Design an enzyme around this catalytic site. Structure first.
Site, short mmCIF file in Angstrom:
data_model
loop_
_atom_site.label_atom_id
_atom_site.label_comp_id
_atom_site.label_asym_id
_atom_site.label_seq_id
_atom_site.Cartn_x
_atom_site.Cartn_y
_atom_site.Cartn_z
CE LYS A 85 6.20 -11.52 4.43
NZ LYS A 85 7.35 -11.84 3.54
CG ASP A 100 -3.44 10.10 11.06
OD1 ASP A 100 -2.54 10.01 10.20
OD2 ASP A 100 -4.31 10.99 11.05
CD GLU A 157 -2.13 11.21 -0.48
OE1 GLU A 157 -2.33 11.43 0.74
OE2 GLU A 157 -3.06 11.00 -1.29
N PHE A 158 2.36 10.36 2.42
CA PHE A 158 3.44 10.63 3.36
C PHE A 158 4.38 9.44 3.54
N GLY A 159 4.11 8.32 2.88
CA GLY A 159 4.96 7.16 3.01
C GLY A 159 4.33 5.95 2.34
CB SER A 160 5.44 3.29 0.45
OG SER A 160 5.05 4.14 -0.61
CB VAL A 161 2.84 -0.04 4.14
CG1 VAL A 161 2.96 -1.28 5.02
CG2 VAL A 161 2.42 1.16 4.98
N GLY A 173 0.80 -1.20 0.00
CA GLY A 173 0.00 0.00 0.00
C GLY A 173 0.84 1.26 0.00
CD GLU A 174 3.42 3.21 -4.32
OE1 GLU A 174 2.73 3.99 -5.00
OE2 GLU A 174 4.47 2.69 -4.74
NE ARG A 227 -8.61 6.00 7.01
CZ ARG A 227 -8.43 7.31 6.83
NH1 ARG A 227 -8.77 7.88 5.68
NH2 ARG A 227 -7.92 8.05 7.81
CG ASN A 228 -4.87 4.87 10.14
OD1 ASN A 228 -5.02 4.52 8.96
ND2 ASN A 228 -4.41 6.07 10.47
CG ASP A 249 -1.17 3.64 10.80
OD1 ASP A 249 -0.05 3.13 10.57
OD2 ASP A 249 -2.18 3.41 10.11
N1 E56 Z 1 -2.48 -7.01 -0.32
C1 E56 Z 1 -2.49 -7.11 0.81
C2 E56 Z 1 -2.51 -7.24 2.33
C3 E56 Z 1 -3.12 -8.33 2.92
C4 E56 Z 1 -3.14 -8.45 4.30
C5 E56 Z 1 -2.54 -7.48 5.09
C6 E56 Z 1 -1.92 -6.39 4.49
N2 E56 Z 1 -1.35 -5.47 5.24
C7 E56 Z 1 -0.86 -5.64 6.46
C8 E56 Z 1 -0.36 -4.43 6.90
C9 E56 Z 1 0.26 -4.18 8.12
N3 E56 Z 1 0.83 -5.08 8.89
N4 E56 Z 1 1.32 -4.47 10.01
C10 E56 Z 1 1.06 -3.14 9.94
C11 E56 Z 1 1.34 -2.05 10.81
C12 E56 Z 1 0.93 -0.76 10.48
CL1 E56 Z 1 1.28 0.59 11.58
C13 E56 Z 1 0.24 -0.54 9.29
N5 E56 Z 1 -0.18 0.81 8.94
C14 E56 Z 1 -1.04 1.05 7.71
C15 E56 Z 1 -0.76 2.47 7.13
C16 E56 Z 1 -2.18 3.14 6.94
N6 E56 Z 1 -3.07 2.16 7.10
C17 E56 Z 1 -2.35 1.04 8.04
C18 E56 Z 1 -0.03 -1.60 8.43
C19 E56 Z 1 0.38 -2.92 8.77
C20 E56 Z 1 -0.58 -3.52 5.88
N7 E56 Z 1 -1.19 -4.16 4.89
C21 E56 Z 1 -1.91 -6.27 3.11
#
Ligand code: E56
Length: 261
Positions: free
Chosen positions: A41, A138, A23-27, A20-21, A142-143, A156
């Site tokens: 993981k 925040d 605007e202030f960062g990417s994951v 997930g991308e 979603r968070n 978050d």
């Molecule tokens: N395809 C796909 C798919 C499927 C299953 C799960 C995910 N998936 C897990 C995470 C995630 N694991 N641990 C996190 C800790 C934080 Cl802090 C955040 N922060 C995000 C920034 C803003 N929204 C939350 C995310 C995670 C993010 N995606 C993706």
């Protein structure tokens, strides 16, 4: 000082794909090698002086000493813009989980017991952070992340979502715990509506005026008067009149008690 333990070498981390991308960062997904020799993981969330870097990693140190079932743990920080290494949740975010619950292949009709249990989870988390005087800034469905035991943990937290911000922050540019209470009411509205975008028909720039005329989020269709009272208490104009996360958590807990199994 010796709080360099929050910093983790990039060699122990193996980055993967983008989940997930913003605007202030990417994951990104990643693997973290540990002292045990085993790898876990992890999610890696990317992001100018040596006084703000210290503040980022020190606040990060506090978050690393946090330990609550409904609050995420901070595994580490790499410096290669910084990169925040947190645990990985396979079930994902609650917003997408609810929207999926409305679809047939996903979950079934998520009952009010499960929705309220989610709200109680987020309430215990945000209350835990409130007792340590930490501000989320925040808070949204979603968070909020779902764990392997189907529990919701806040995430978050640390260092647009205008519709989630309180009036005192839209005007005085001040952010207190009661603003997080407002975000908690909006999140409850999301969980009850199962992913509806807040304030329909009102654009993002009309929020302040819309709230300055006393108009708050309307009661959903299937919602109960108790739930809407709990939400409405969070959207009051004066933070002193708003309830605290402890009181909210106990209210939702008793309300969940009164319902059939
Ligand atoms: N395809 C796909 C798919 C499927 C299953 C799960 C995910 N998936 C897990 C995470 C995630 N694991 N641990 C996190 C800790 C934080 Cl802090 C955040 N922060 C995000 C920034 C803003 N929204 C939350 C995310 C995670 C993010 N995606 C993706």
């Amino acid at each position: 000082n010796k709080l360099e333990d929050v910093v983790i070498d990039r060699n122990l981390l193996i980055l993967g794909k983008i989940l997930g991308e913003g605007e202030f960062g990417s994951v990104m997904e990643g693997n973290l090698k540990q002292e045990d020799g085993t790898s876990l993981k992890v999610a890696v969330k990317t992001m100018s002086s040596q006084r703000e870097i210290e503040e980022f990693l020190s606040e990060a140190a506090c978050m690393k000493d946090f330990s609550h079932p409904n609050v995420m743990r901070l595994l580490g920080v790499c410096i290669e813009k910084p990169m925040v290494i947190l645990p990985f949740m396979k079930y994902g975010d609650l917003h997408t989980y609810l929207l999926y619950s409305r679809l047939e292949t996903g979950p079934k009709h998520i009952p009010l017991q499960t929705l309220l249990k989610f709200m109680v989870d987020i309430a215990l988390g945000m209350e835990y952070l409130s007792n340590r005087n930490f501000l989320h800034r925040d808070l949204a469905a979603r968070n909020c992340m779902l764990r392997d035991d189907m529990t919701v943990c806040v995430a978050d937290f640390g260092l647009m979502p205008v519709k989630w911000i309180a009036i005192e922050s839209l005007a005085d540019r001040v952010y207190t715990s009661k603003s997080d209470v407002w975000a908690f009411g909006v999140t409850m509205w999301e969980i009850a509506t199962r992913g509806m975008t807040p304030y329909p028909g009102v654009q993002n720039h009309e929020m302040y005026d819309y709230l300055l005329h006393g108009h708050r989020l309307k009661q959903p269709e299937d919602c109960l008067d108790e739930l809407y009272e709990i939400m409405y208490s969070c959207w009051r104009t004066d933070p002193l009149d708003r309830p605290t996360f402890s009181v909210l958590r106990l209210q939702l807990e008793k309300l969940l008690e009164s319902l059939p199994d």
